[PDB]
Amino acid sequence: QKKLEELELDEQQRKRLEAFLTQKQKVGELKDDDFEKISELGAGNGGVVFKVSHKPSGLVMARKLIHLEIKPAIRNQIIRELQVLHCNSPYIVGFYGAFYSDGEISICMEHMDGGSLDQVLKKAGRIPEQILGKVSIAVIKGLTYLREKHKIMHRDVKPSNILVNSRGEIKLCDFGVSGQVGTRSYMSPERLQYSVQSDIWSMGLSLVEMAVGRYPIPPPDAKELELMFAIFELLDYIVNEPPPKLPSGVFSLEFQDFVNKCLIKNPAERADLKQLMVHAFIKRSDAEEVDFAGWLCSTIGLNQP
Numbered sequence: 001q002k003k004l005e006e007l008e009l010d011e012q013q014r015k016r017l018e019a020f021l022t023q024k025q026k027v028g029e030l031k032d033d034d035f036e037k038i039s040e041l042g043a044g045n046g047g048v049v050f051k052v053s054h055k056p057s058g059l060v061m062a063r064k065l066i067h068l069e070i071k072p073a074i075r076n077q078i079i080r081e082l083q084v085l086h087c088n089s090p091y092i093v094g095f096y097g098a099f100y101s102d103g104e105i106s107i108c109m110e111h112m113d114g115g116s117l118d119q120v121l122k123k124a125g126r127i128p129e130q131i132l133g134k135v136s137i138a139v140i141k142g143l144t145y146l147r148e149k150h151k152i153m154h155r156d157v158k159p160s161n162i163l164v165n166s167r168g169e170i171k172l173c174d175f176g177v178s179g180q181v182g183t184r185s186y187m188s189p190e191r192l193q194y195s196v197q198s199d200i201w202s203m204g205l206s207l208v209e210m211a212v213g214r215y216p217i218p219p220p221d222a223k224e225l226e227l228m229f230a231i232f233e234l235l236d237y238i239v240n241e242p243p244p245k246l247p248s249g250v251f252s253l254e255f256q257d258f259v260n261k262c263l264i265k266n267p268a269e270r271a272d273l274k275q276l277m278v279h280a281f282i283k284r285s286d287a288e289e290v291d292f293a294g295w296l297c298s299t300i301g302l303n304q305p
């Protein structure tokens with residue numbers, strides 16, 4: 001009916017956060033020896049990432065390995081810096097722990113069974129508007145948390161940083177680095193010359209990317225839209241040229257307006273989190289009852305039961 005009732009942290013969310021905490025605690029010490037490899041998730045980037053079983057617990061996790069040599073007590077420091085990922089947000093990927101072994105940093109995260117939205121994009125081709133509404137909500141809230149707690153620089157909001165799962169959860173994985181770009185840049189115009197204003201830009205660029213199915217600078221221009229429905233050069237383009245936009249006709253005017261407000265070049269004019277939270281796209285999005293899990297499971301060929 002017209003119930004519209006959950007909470008600030010819908011008790012389910014609150015419960016899932018508690019459950020995760022408890023499980024993280026009963027895992028205990030994290031030794032290379034306790035990990036049976038299941039598969040190789042999205043690899044490469046800074047380092048390969050593996051899906052693994054942790055024999056003691058019987059938990060599936062995502063373990064990311066970065067190669068870095070030296071291990072002189074100050075490592076238990078480098079590890080302590082990583083221990084700052086030990087975040088309590090529904091819009092932030094869970095962290096189990098981190099260790100060193102065999103000249104290799106391990107960072108063990110919660111297994112998100114839908115993977116990253118860059119990988120979903122490849123299976124989907126395009127990600128539809130109602131799904132990107134829910135994505136938008138999760139990202140905005142995730143930034144809100146980070147801004148009102150971690151004061152963390154984050155780094156970027158890209159599809160590769162947005163993980164999803166068959167429970168319909170959407171979490172940022174972008175986690176910072178102190179670690180002592182081929183055609184695509186998500187850098188705001190202002191930072192090509194910190195704060196959330198840069199992240200609002202990236203999210204806006206990423207929504208266009210996921211909506212059209214293609215990194216949108218330079219614009220498809222040459223029809224492509226009719227069909228569909230270097231770094232240095234690109235940077236001056238982002239600074240000099242006008243921001244991207246969704247094509248018309250295909251996307252709601254609400255949706256076009258929302259992304260338009262994220263991709264205003266001047267950050268003083270560009271929308272802040274508070275305005276996004278009450279934009280009509282978001283209001284409509286929040287009221288829509290979207291079967292995100294079913295969309296997602298079908299798209300990537302995940303067996304639900």
Ligand SMILES: *[C@H]1CC(=O)[C@@H](O)[C@@H](O)C/C=C/c2cc(OC)cc(O)c2C(=O)O[C@@H](C)C1
Pocket residue numbers: 041042043045049061062063064093107108109110111112113114115116159160161163173174
């Ligand atoms: C967080 C994400 C990254 O750092 C980036 O490399 C990401 O795109 C690579 C994918 C990681 C991934 C993939 C799946 O697919 C099923 C599942 C999970 O849980 C993860 C993940 O959380 O990896 C963490 C370590 C990196």
